[model samples]
Target: LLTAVVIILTIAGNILVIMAVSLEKKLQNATNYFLMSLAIADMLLGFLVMPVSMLTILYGYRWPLPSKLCAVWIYLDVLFSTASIMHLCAISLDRYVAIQNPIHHSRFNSRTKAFLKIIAVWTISVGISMPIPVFGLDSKVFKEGSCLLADDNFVLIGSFVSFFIPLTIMVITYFLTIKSLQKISNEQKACKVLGIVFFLFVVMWCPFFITNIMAVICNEDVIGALLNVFVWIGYLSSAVNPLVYTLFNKTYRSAFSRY
Candidate 1:
């Protein structure tokens, strides 16, 4: 039930963000532009990742696909999640800087600058997921249809980078931007959307990240199927952003209402 309903909402809602940005001229800017890609990533997550993975979750021990697509599936899941985090980190920092110092912010802000900045983020996210294709799909990594990466070193390293470090960076930047001025956005209207989505990001994805760390740190065997639910919880984040946008955004009471 969760999987079926969620997959639909995820695609439909994020599709609104994708359309809202492109069709509405007012929704065009650095932060909004950042959301465009974020929307796209989540939509793919809805369309591609969750549908396949959830079935495998049910089958439990069987991968339900060839080893090659197992790698592809895992890679997209990791890549989009990583890319989502990177885009979020970029949005938070970008807003903080733009908010904290508007005078000089204008100097560094431009379409090309913002585009390149986002470009670097996806690149970093891709690089974070690189070792998968090269070494992750193998006899050891995928055996007996259990498609979990067995290596601890890579997991520990990537786990911290993709989630922990980004959380630290995001929290610090968000607060500093908060402290710089006890203010919020109207002119930078996308800021509201940014905070709402960011809040949901941490809220929705925290359990998944914690479960990973717990598996590594606690090494408990009881939580075998627990990881799958957490992963599904993480997938729920992909759908909530559009819900946030339509409810929070005051500018176009109807941009999403057109739905």
Candidate 2:
């Protein structure tokens, strides 16, 4: 029941995000545009990735689907998650530049530039995830009877590139953006809002990556089984993102409430 709710909420919530950005004229901006892209990734994660995960979990983590399908699932999973983090990372930088007084209304603020950056983010995520489909399936994808990635080397490197690196950039840019914004405004609490965002992001997604790294580096027995558990925690972050937007942004609340 928990799993079903998570999947449903992730899909439905992100769909609203897409529609809110698309239909609501007030929500149409570069930052919201990035958010809309992230929503597409999260919604697809729920639609394409989570259902198969539900299938496997239902059957006790066994690969009930075809062997090739497992690889495809992992590819999509990695791609979307990477895209999500990349969007966030880009958002931080975008906010920082947009907030700069030098060119508060910069030429790059246009939607065309926003789309270019978004496309670049997606392309990089694809490049990061592309190796899985070809080389990953060459060996056992169903590691230890579960539809999990088998290569420690691949996932270990992936953890850094996909999560940690982007996280570092995002954190740094977010603080820089916040610091810049503080010069003008003490009236609003972007600190609390951004603080909550960073806190939720790290708390929900940290365990999965940390556990995978520890399992690979420490060679512990208990940790292997825990991957099945921790990955879902990471996936839950998908649903959590929209909730943050709705809570923090009044426009999102008003927009979401209307429909």
Candidate 3:
């Protein structure tokens, strides 16, 4: 039931984001390339990943598929999950530069740069994700039982590279952006709104990260339980993004009107 609700809402919400971005020509700028990437990741995860995850969880994670499908599922999970984080970081940095130094923002945020950054993001994302297969995390079914999230040095390095690194960068960038905006003596409601979005992002996912950290260090079972709740909270963030833009950006408001 929880899984079904999550799948339904996530899929519906990401579909709305894709629609809004596609319909809003004004939003079709270099900056929105990251938004496009984010929507695609969320949508793909919704279709290809989350449903299977819910099914597997319901079935005691015993996935009856052959080893090949298991590899594909794990790889896709890594791919889309890493892509989502990197895309968020890209947007946060882009917005930070735009807010802190609007004069040179156009130069730093050109179409070519956007394309290259996207390519670079995916390339690095693949690099960070590849270690899963190299380690025992990708396939290698165990005789004891199957569990979500592998236990290895991979957990530490993987969590740091995939989640914490991008999260840390976003925190710093948002702080700087807000500080710079305040220095200008102009109140930016849009900035405030995004600040709240990022804050929610952090709060929603922090328990997951912290528990992952504790799981790496001490292998705490209670932390794992807390992390599960936080994971669902993190998934809810997808439904929140389009709503945020709709309230704060007139373009998104008008674009969604057609829906």
Tell me the TM-score of each prediction against the true structure: 0.88, 0.91, 0.87
Q: By TM-score, how accurate is candidate 3?
A: 0.87
Q: Please list the Cα RMSD from the true structure of every candidate, rounded to 1 decimal place.
A: 2.7, 2.1, 2.6
Candidate 1 residue lDDT tens string, 10-46: 8888877777777888878776777787787678888
Residues 1-259, candidate 2: write the lDDT tens digits.
Answer: 5889999899888888888788788877776777877887778889888888888888976767777687888889989888888877777677667766547557556888788989999998999999987788646467667677769898888899888898888778777767776662432576667767777887888898999887777634578567777888888989887778655678888877898
lDDT for position 168 in model 3: 83
lDDT of each: 0.76, 0.79, 0.71
Clashing pairs in 2: none
Clashing pairs in 3: none
- Against the true structure, whose lDDT is highest? 2
* Model 2 spans with C-alpha error above 4 angstroms: 102-107, 138-140, 182-187, 219-221
Model 1: residues >4 Å from true position, as ranges? 183-199, 219-221
After superposition, which runs of candidate 3 have C-alpha atoms over 4 Å from their true positions? 137-144, 184-186, 219-224, 245-247
Relative to the unseen true structure, what is the C-alpha lDDT of residue 205 in candidate 2, on a scale of 0 to 100?
A: 83
Given candidate 1, what's the lDDT at residue 170?
83
